[PDB]
Amino acid sequence: RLVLGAALKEAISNNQLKLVYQPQIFAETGELYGIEALARWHDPLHGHVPPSRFIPLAEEIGEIENIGRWVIAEACRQLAEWRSQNIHIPALSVNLSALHFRSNQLPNQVSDAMHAWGIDGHQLTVEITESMMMEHDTEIFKRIQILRDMGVGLSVDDFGLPVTEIKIDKSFVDRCLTEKRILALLEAITSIGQSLNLTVVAEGVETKEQFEMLRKIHCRVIQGYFFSRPLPAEEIPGWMSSVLPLK
What we know:
Residues 1-244 form the EAL domain. This is Oxygen sensor protein DosP. Homodimer; has been previously suggested to be a homotetramer based on size exclusion chromatography. Forms a complex with DosC. The PDB classes it as signaling protein,hydrolase. The entry lists the keywords EAL domain, cyclic di-GMP phosphodiesterase, TIM-barrel, EcDos. By secondary structure, the protein is of the alpha/beta class. The protein has one domain: TIM Barrel. The chain has nine helices and ten strands. It has helices spanning 4-9, 51-54, 67-83, 108-116, 140-148, 170-178, 180-195, 208-216, 236-242, and strands at 17-26, 32-43, 47-49, 92-95, 124-128, 153-156, 165-168, 199-203, 221-223, 231-232. A hairpin with a 5-residue loop joins strand 1 (17-26) and strand 2 (32-43). Helix 3 (67-83) runs parallel beside helix 4 (108-116). The protein starts with a helix and ends in a 5-residue tail after the last helix.
């Protein structure tokens, strides 16, 4: 805004723009399925600013221009940095809806990032919501298909068919324990994923009781506080070395 708008403008050049990573874990095996990359921004004042606070506030350089382009760059940078000691990771997810990607004129930044850093493709997954589904005929799915040719998976958020992953919002995970009809509604979603081999993932899983619930309705992967909060890049391999699987 009056000050931080220029500060966020120089987040790449002020040595404090980072990414945090949240682990996604299989239900039955307890093995690591993938990891979601979450953008972060630290400042000498006002401390750490979540993507729920600075991304809508970015209105000079980037709405898609420098925000989403840096996230995929660092994520691919981190994948290669991690591969330097261990391949380990099956896949890494990147939220496009949260980063306000919305604009559909720049899919090249993702492709070029896969070129600048080693291999990738099937190790990447893009996440969009219902608000980004069609967008007044901007040929989104036409450019998503181009990404699918590279091996990059597609992921749908909330919503409680060229997709590869379906994410379940926390608000729906909460209502399943008290309302068994919205549980059956999720059991319908997990029926689609089990039949069409689509990875259904559930966000915001806090307690043990709701994990056992998703366990018996055959929800593939669990993402939430029950396993681990979003973790920084430096202590991810140790976390996998220490406690994994968590069965």
